[PDB]
């Protein structure tokens, strides 16, 4: 499989590279998404560039690692960046994706509040955990989930970061639990990576 | 320049077949330039290759047709290209099946290969047609207060829940519209039911919880149901 990071950002008027692991041929492409656009092919071959994609974008190759590199960032170039390859015979797979943020305001670090199942959502027999992230910037974090000290991958949902009033990202994660695995752990955490950073809350059945 | 259009139905209930038209213009897909496919990305996240096919054959076969190992028991594709579309078939949907599907043209070593042709990348994308797996009918939401304590430096943070409603949209304010400023409601998630959440949640100072009703205001207007749920302070 292909591993890209998950984000990376730059100023307007530098430059910077995004790399992709695992390539291990030259049928290595890379695609610009706009958000709620189509992907867009902005290099194929390693290092060719479509007709009407700007010389600053290139890119290149070194052992099984590509490399997408922006000269000169405008702000147009903000974007979700996606390597893509020719695996086996005659397979196609892509990478996650970099989130690629054109640095317009301070970075902020974000808030985060985490809400215990509601006692009317209990009575139904429900139970949702709401972990709220706010008022951070770039707009990408990762959400991981904590039963006690064990991570939690099952019943996770989060939705992609978007833009509040006040021009910063908020973001939400949910997890599902039954009433009685909410009551069986001591206690349930919320972590967000964002940048260097992670901000961890924690609610307990027992306050 | 050319222009791909993807059609069909954009909700199909679990277990039934997605069926999906793509019409080309500006090119031909009977000609051997390109392979024809489908590119498909799951709400919120990456891109999934499902398939490509050609009718130009070799002197061994009648054309290539190359698919997604992890879909090939569910998927058939097609070319009609006196007509020049695109198709796609999958059968026995889940909600894993539910994303925006492209239709692609596909790139590399295919004019001219060895051994066998090589469609390595994607030059030329539909616009996207997003398909929801869900099998729910219409129905109004049940909302919930995530309610503050009596939270974080003079300010209190509270909203709601909004669980299980469908189809989209749901609409959500506060107080009448009187307090907008700090609100923030959240995209909704498709759950694995087949039903759609989200979320909406406001800041306020901490000295009004004790005097300041709070209420959202939750429309949704697929099922003519609105719902006013007041958000109280923990006990
Ligand atoms: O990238 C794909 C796959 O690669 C790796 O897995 C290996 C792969 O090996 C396939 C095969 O390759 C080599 O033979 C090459 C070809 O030689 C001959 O011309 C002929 O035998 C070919 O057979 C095809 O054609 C005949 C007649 O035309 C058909 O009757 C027959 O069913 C074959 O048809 C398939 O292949 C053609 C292209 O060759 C397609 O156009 C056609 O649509 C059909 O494709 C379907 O089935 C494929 C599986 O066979 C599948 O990959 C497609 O997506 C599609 O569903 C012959 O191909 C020799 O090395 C030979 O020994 C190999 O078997 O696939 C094997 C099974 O998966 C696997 O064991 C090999 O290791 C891995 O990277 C893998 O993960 C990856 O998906």
């Known amino acids: 499989a292909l591993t890209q990071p998950p984000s990376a950002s730059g100023s307007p008027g530098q430059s910077i590279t995004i790399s992709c692991t695992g390539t291990?041929?030259?049928?290595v492409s890379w695609y610009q998404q706009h958000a709620g656009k189509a992907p867009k092919l902005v290099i194929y071959?390693?290092?060719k560039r479509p007709s009407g994609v700007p010389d600053r974008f290139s890119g290149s190759k070194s052992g099984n690692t590509a490399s997408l590199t922006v000269s000169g960032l405008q702000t147009d170039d903000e974007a979700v960046y996606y390597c893509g390859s020719l695996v086996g015979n005659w397979d196609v797979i892509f990478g996650g994706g970099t989130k690629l943020t054109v640095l317009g305001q301070p970075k902020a670090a974000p808030s985060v509040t985490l809400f215990p199942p509601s006692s009317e959502e209990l009575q139904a027999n429900k139970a949702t955990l709401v972990c709220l992230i706010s008022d951070f910037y770039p707009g990408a974090v990762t959400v991981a989930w904590k039963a006690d000290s064990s991570p939690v991958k099952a019943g996770v949902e989060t939705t992609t970061p978007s833009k509040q009033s006040n021009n910063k990202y908020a973001a939400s994660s949910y997890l599902s639990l039954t009433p009685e695995q909410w009551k069986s752990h001591r206690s349930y955490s919320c972590q967000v990576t964002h940048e260097g950073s992670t901000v961890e809350k924690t609610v307990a059945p027992t306050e | 320049q050319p222009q791909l259009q993807e059609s069909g139905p954009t909700l199909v209930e679990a277990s039934e077949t997605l069926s999906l038209t793509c019409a080309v213009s500006?090119?031909?897909?009977?000609?051997?330039?390109?392979?024809w496919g489908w590119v498909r990305q799951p709400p919120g996240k990456g891109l999934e290759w499902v398939g490509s096919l050609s009718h130009c054959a070799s002197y061994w076969n009648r054309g290539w047709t190359y698919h997604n190992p992890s879909l090939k028991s569910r998927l058939t594709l097609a070319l009609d290209t006196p007509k020049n579309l695109v198709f796609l078939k999958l059968n026995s949907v889940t909600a894993a099946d539910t994303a925006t599907y492209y239709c692609?043209?596909?790139?590399?070593?295919?004019?001219?290969?060895?051994?066998?042709?090589?469609?390595?990348?994607?030059?030329?994308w539909g616009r996207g047609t997003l398909v929801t797996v869900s099998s729910a009918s219409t129905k109004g939401p049940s909302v919930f207060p995530l309610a503050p304590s009596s939270t974080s430096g003079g300010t209190a943070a509270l909203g709601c829940l909004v669980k299980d409603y469908f189809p989209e949209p749901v609409t959500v304010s506060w107080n009448s519209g009187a307090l907008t400023s700090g609100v923030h409601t959240f995209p909704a998630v498709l759950q694995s039911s087949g039903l759609y959440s989200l979320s909406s949640v406001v800041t306020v100072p901490s000295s009004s919880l004790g005097t300041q009703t709070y209420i959202c205001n939750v429309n949704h207007k697929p099922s003519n149901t609105k719902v006013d749920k007041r958000v109280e302070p923990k006990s």
């Open positions: 500006g090119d031909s897909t009977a000609a051997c330039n390109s392979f």
């Open positions: 692609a043209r596909f790139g590399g070593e295919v004019l001219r290969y060895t051994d066998w042709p090589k469609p390595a990348w994607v030059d030329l």
């Open positions: 291990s041929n030259n049928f």
């Open positions: 071959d390693v290092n």
